Amino acid sequence: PQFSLWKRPVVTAYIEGQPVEVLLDTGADDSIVAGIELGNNYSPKIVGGIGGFINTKEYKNVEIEVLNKKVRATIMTGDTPINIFGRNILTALGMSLNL
Amino acid sequence: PQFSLWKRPVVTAYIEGQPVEVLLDTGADDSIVAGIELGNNYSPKIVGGIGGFINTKEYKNVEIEVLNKKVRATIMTGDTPINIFGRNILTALGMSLNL
Numbered sequence: 478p479q480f481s482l483w484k485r486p487v488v489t490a491y492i493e494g495q496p497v498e499v500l501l502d503t504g505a506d507d508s509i510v511a512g513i514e515l516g517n518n519y520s521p522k523i524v525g526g527i528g529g530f531i532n533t534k535e536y537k538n539v540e541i542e543v544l545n546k547k548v549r550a551t552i553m554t555g556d557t558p559i560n561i562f563g564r565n566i567l568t569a570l571g572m573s574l575n576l
Numbered sequence: 577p578q579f580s581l582w583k584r585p586v587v588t589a590y591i592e593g594q595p596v597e598v599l600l601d602t603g604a605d606d607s608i609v610a611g612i613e614l615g616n617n618y619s620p621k622i623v624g625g626i627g628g629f630i631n632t633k634e635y636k637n638v639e640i641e642v643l644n645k646k647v648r649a650t651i652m653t654g655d656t657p658i659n660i661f662g663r664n665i666l667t668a669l670g671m672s673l674n675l
């Protein structure tokens with residue numbers, strides 16, 4: 478696949494079997510999703526961007542299916558306004574950003 | 577050029593001659609830069625990031641030098657913790673996300 482960035486690069490992923498729309502985001506080190514519950518085994522952490530900061534719950538070794546690939550990766554949950562697949566997942570998939 | 581995403585895709589750029597560190601950000605619609613001073617010829621814009629909304633100053637037809645190219649694009653200045661070149665500039669540069 479190629480994403481020409483004329484539009485937001487948004488795709489459907491399955492996280493622990495739940496479908497979610499996610500933004501493929503080179504400007505995110507990590508990945509953060511809203512609307513899914515991953516359980517009591519997490520590490521709380523704060524992240525920051527435009528507009529401020531949010532509390533998140535960091536989960537390791539989460540099953541992710543996206544772009545017809547299956548990977549296991551770290552996912553934060555929190556009250557993000559958009560679901561973000563950052564570089565930890567993009568690299569796991571073998572994605573690159575090219576000029 | 578190629579960004580393999582194991583590290584942040586950060587580069588240096590000039591905005592009307594002013595040097596900046598910028599993050600190539602496929603998750604950003606717009607390009608938002610802090611600290612540079614582009615003058616009084618702007619319109620206010622409202623931008624929503626992970627944490628909430630900020631006001632920005634929108635400047636059109638700004639000269640930008642990055643990745644050995646020169647383009648004219650819209651820059652918004654405001655309080656972002658990381659300067660980001662979003663898809664308005666990535667498309668002007670002819671960049672893409674690939675797997």
Ligand SMILES: CC(C)CN(C[C@@H](O)[C@H](Cc1ccccc1)NC(=O)O[C@@H]1C[C@@H]2CCO[C@@H]2C1)S(=O)(=O)c1ccc(CO)cc1
Nearest residue numbers: 504505506507524525526527603604605606624625626658
């Ligand atoms: C500002 C970047 C340095 C870090 N962001 C990733 C960006 O692509 C971030 C992703 C995002 C967030 C909220 C709504 C829509 C998209 N785009 C971003 O702010 O773009 C700004 C805000 C506006 C809406 C999208 O385009 C306009 C320009 S982020 O704050 O979301 C973030 C911060 C920390 C982590 C954890 O590593 C993940 C994401």
Ligand SMILES: [Cl-]
Nearest residue numbers: 540541542547
């Ligand atoms: Cl499986």
Ligand SMILES: [Cl-]
Nearest residue numbers: 575576577578
């Ligand atoms: Cl190329």
Ligand SMILES: [Cl-]
Nearest residue numbers: 580581582583
């Ligand atoms: Cl890299």
Ligand SMILES: [Cl-]
Nearest residue numbers: 580581582583
């Ligand atoms: Cl490297």
Ligand SMILES: [Cl-]
Nearest residue numbers: 590592593641
């Ligand atoms: Cl210059």
Ligand SMILES: [Cl-]
Nearest residue numbers: 604605606664
């Ligand atoms: Cl926009």
Ligand SMILES: [Cl-]
Nearest residue numbers: 620621622623
């Ligand atoms: Cl606006």
Ligand SMILES: [Cl-]
Nearest residue numbers: 606622623624
């Ligand atoms: Cl916005």
Ligand code: NA
Nearest residue numbers: 516517518519
């Ligand atoms: Na526990």
Ligand SMILES: [Zn+2]
Nearest residue numbers: 494540542547
């Ligand atoms: Zn499975």
Ligand SMILES: [Zn+2]
Nearest residue numbers: 491494542543
């Ligand atoms: Zn499946």
Ligand SMILES: [Zn+2]
Nearest residue numbers: 555556557558
């Ligand atoms: Zn909320």
Ligand SMILES: [Zn+2]
Nearest residue numbers: 575576577670
């Ligand atoms: Zn090329």
Ligand SMILES: [Zn+2]
Nearest residue numbers: 580581582583
């Ligand atoms: Zn590298």
Ligand SMILES: [Zn+2]
Nearest residue numbers: 590592593641
């Ligand atoms: Zn110049």
